[PDB]
Amino acid sequence: AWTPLEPKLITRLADTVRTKGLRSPITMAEVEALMSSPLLPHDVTNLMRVILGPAPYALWMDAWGVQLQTVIAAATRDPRHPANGQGRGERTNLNRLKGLADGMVGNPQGQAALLRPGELVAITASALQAFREVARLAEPWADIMQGPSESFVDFANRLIKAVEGSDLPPSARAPVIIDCFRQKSQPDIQQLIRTAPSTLTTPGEIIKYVLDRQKTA
Amino acid sequence: PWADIMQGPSESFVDFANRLIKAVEGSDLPPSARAPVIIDCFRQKSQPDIQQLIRTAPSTLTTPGEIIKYVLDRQKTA
Amino acid sequence: AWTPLEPKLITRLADTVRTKGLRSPITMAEVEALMSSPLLPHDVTNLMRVILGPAPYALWMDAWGVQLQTVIAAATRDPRHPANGQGRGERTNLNRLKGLADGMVGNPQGQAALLRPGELVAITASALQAFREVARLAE
Amino acid sequence: AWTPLEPKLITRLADTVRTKGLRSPITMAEVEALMSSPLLPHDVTNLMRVILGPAPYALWMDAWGVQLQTVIAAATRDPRHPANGQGRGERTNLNRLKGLADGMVGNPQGQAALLRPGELVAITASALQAFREVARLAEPWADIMQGPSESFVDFANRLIKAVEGSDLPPSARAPVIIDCFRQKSQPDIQQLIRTAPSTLTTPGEIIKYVLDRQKTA
Amino acid sequence: PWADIMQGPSESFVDFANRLIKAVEGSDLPPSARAPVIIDCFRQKSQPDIQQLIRTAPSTLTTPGEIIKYVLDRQKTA
Amino acid sequence: AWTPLEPKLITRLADTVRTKGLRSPITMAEVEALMSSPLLPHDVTNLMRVILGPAPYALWMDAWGVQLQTVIAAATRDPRHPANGQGRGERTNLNRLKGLADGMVGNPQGQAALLRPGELVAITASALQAFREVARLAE
Amino acid sequence: AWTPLEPKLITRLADTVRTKGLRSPITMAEVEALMSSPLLPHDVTNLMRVILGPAPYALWMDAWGVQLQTVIAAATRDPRHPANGQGRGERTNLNRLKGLADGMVGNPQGQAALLRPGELVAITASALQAFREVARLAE
Amino acid sequence: PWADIMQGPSESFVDFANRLIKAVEGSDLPPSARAPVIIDCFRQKSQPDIQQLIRTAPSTLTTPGEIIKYVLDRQKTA
Amino acid sequence: PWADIMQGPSESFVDFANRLIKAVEGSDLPPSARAPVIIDCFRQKSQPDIQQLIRTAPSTLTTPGEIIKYVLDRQKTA
Amino acid sequence: AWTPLEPKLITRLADTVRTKGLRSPITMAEVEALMSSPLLPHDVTNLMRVILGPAPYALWMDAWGVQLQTVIAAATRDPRHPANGQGRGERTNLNRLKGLADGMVGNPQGQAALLRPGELVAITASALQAFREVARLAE
């Protein structure tokens, strides 16, 4: 049986997106919260219709379609998908994922009837990744300098934000953050990091060391 | 009225796109005529800097979302 | 069955951390409040992702790992840990504590399935101590 | 039968290292040339003794030992090493790799007698990697800017050199080079790359595009 | 003479293109050598503002008509 | 059996490229000279690594890949390629042309073992055309 | 048998284009009038050479080529084109449409001999659409 | 003579290390006494900036190569 | 009174350390509270040059003797 | 039975340290003289408290602890230490060396009761080496 999401939660989430934006960590946390139970295509579609403006909604429809197509390629590449079945008669078409299949168009009850839980979780993960893409797209790390009057934790926050919310691969963020701590972060902290008797091999360790030995002023 | 919407000299592009898509979808057009109208309004409105930016697109943009993404990528930061 | 924490409480706690800071006694009391029931690694990880900024979150990940490693050393020093079992097949690896073990990565339901209550309370106490360390370090 | 390397080639390589340095691509090519046939520990040891100074030679001995230890760990992790055998009596100890085993100390003929070809190629690859490490160590990418009067190919050469000869993982060099082309490379070329009707997803493609559409001056 | 044609400081681009195409097609060149010559004369004549405008073309222009269209689109209105 | 090119000739060619440039007819003649015998992917790759700077080397890798792809399209368009065989089991993949196939990665001896002479001459002609393109592009 | 268009009509049409412009409805009506019978590539090419200036003629050649390419794509998408035949030996190449095929280059008589009526009407419609595009573009 | 080698005020550290290792290895010392002597000469020669740099080493350096690497990492670029 | 002891502008560091340790050990504090107090008084007294010298210690100093040794090593000779 | 050192000798040694310094060979000879019989931790501690100033005394406490720790590492590396015994129940902890063990804190009589002669000579040699280190460090 299908139960709709509360319009109160949806209104609060819409106002959160309206004030904080699409990319704030609080907004992504709220979306993850409302993305907890596996949603039917109807639910996610209406949710994005309400919380997103028209142009971000178009972008999100595009990105969701692309991610679902990648999922269906992986599904035809492995007959053991939690959305698939063992025989060929359970293969999942994009009409069934986007809610366009027979007995599902516009009807959430029938949708909830025919859909699999693996189908639901795959749709949900696809929608979350698409939301992340559109949020990163709607709104430069190598131009970030620590201002003469700025503290170090603010500079580290800004730099880690801009590096993690960028187009780098996940395996290239830590070395870039370290080498940006070393070359940015005006020459007092540069020399403080340079003359480190220990070898610092993690942004957290560098931050801890600098916070310990920083010039109180 | 959708056909009277222009991108202001100081207005950003996402605000203009929001306003235009709102006015086009909340109008008397058939559902199958909204995307072409939105595209052709992006091309003829949206003051001549973005007009030339869309004109000189090495790829063919056939969707309002794709046009918005392209313009947001290559827009003149100011 | 896993139940998420209210985003309203999380938003209020995030604004508390934003205005009062990390070290105020009211903030530590609020964290102790939201640290009442034993949380799964997913819950604590997302909570610290939301309430803490990027750099304090990195520091907190480091400190949480160190405290969990101390816990696992004490666990291999005593086979009667409430996270351990009697036989060697119940020994708890750090992949199971950090939520990285098999059947747990990204899935909170499976996490809640395989985890022990002693595991949960140890993870929770470790996260609280790590939060205290990072708060004392940030300012 | 052991044949020594020509002292003429060794003298030419030593003078190459003396004039060009340790890190020049011509020097690494020459080392790869003299590292073509599998060398015995005696050969590589004397070669590095002659071409390298005292302090780089100490560093190289350290690095060679570390790399050989990694090799021996991989060897005890796989009994099918081309240096190992099938039974336990053919397991290769570090005394046999460094030439310290019985019947090998100071004698290159006996060395060549008892050593395996897999042993020789493993020693050689280890020595090459150690040379690379020491060369990278003996002599910052995020501080590189394109000067007001500098051409773009010189800036690209300098940047790619500093990025590839750094501590980044191999899978993080291309995105960093691209994002440094975009944020460095003074605002004329910045706007030239920004207004690219096509999406450039490779440093070579960016270089080609900029060289085509650059302002001749 | 086609190789002596320059775009004057005050002359528009369509007049320069007309004059150049006229002088190139009404000359002693083979028919298969007119288009490359017209293109390379657009690129080297046509005073440095339009020279840089053609140089920084994100697309590759391989026809005099395409070059004329591009320049007419992105020209500095004055 | 694989024999490397002389580092003396390579050093002289590198200094020629350094003083005369990439596009001089003397430089192209010298490259044609050192491009006389069919080279293995290892040889051409190291040669271009040594004689070319970093950015021209990136451009040359791109151009070489494109030309090899054109060659492989012509090869799938004609089963009588001197690199191909008569049956389908001798069809030449780009991993075998770029030296990335199995038994070839980093090993020039195995490379010389498995490669065909038609493969070698096709790789060599492709590399020469790519060098010409990059030289025309750099200046 | 090929019959040329009257130079009197062509002179009147050229003066019409000279005074009224390319986009006036009277000019388009006159072009439709002189575009009544299916013309051979020679006829349309010379007509546009005479009535259009040099730069509009270049633009028109471009547009005509593009429209003919769209026509040939539709033709390879449907073997029942009035320019095509049933077998593969009657497929119409762009050299035959632009008048560049064998036995047609510069000779209008041979052109009229080998061309199909469907070919002629397709060429004519393509030229008319190209003229419309160039007229909309010039002013 | 190894015991008379000092790092000049303008000399770099790699040149000083080269000269010192040369003079120590080409001397009358036993082979088992060269490394400790090289280390203790790095510590007492090598003008007081590098002396303090080696003194305040959070790790214990027990090899001339390790000392050279540490000093090259944390040296005052000038 | 130990909590009123400051390092004078012209006073050396060993004299200040002697005076401070004397006043702290000859006071009413418990024996288990003297070392932390001496350390935290070294850190907050001992005028800002030595304060920054102790602050930027790559190693963690957990004893008055270790702090004294470190400061005596890296002190500004004047 | 514990017998204290003469305050006259201690006063003379303190004045020697005051006039000649810590590093003079006469001062080291005098210390070796008063370091002849194996002293209990109480004796050496009070002796260094009296003859050394506050800062040298702190340095000496540090150095003495480090040297005693090296001694205890050598002791756990060899069960035949003259301070150790044969069974594991005679292993000597640092609380017993520094005089901090049970029945020894502040009481020299009980100290002399429970301590071994090997313990005493090890403590004495450690204290002498620590004095040498501090003397070399102070000036």
Task: Tell me about this structure.
The PDB classes it as viral protein. 10 copies of one chain form a homodecamer. With 217 residues, chain A is mainly alpha-helical. Chain A has 2 domains: 1-138, Human Immunodeficiency Virus Type 1 Capsid Protein, CATH 1.10.375.10; 141-213, Orthogonal Bundle (Non-ribosomal Peptide Synthetase Peptidyl Carrier Protein, Chain A). Chain A is 62% helix and 0% strand. Chain A has helices at residues 7-20, 25-34, 41-51, 54-76, 94-97, 108-114, 117-138, 152-164, 173-183, 187-194, 203-213. The relative contact order of chain A is 0.10. Chains in contact: A-B, A-C, A-D, A-H, A-I, B-D, B-E, D-E, D-F, D-H, E-G, H-I, I-J.
Q: Can you tag this structure with a few keywords?
A:
homodecamer; about 220 residues; mainly alpha; Human Immunodeficiency Virus Type 1 Capsid Protein; Non-ribosomal Peptide Synthetase Peptidyl Carrier Protein, Chain A; 2 domains; 11 helices; about 60% helix; Capsid protein p27, alternate cleaved 1 (chains C, F, G, J)
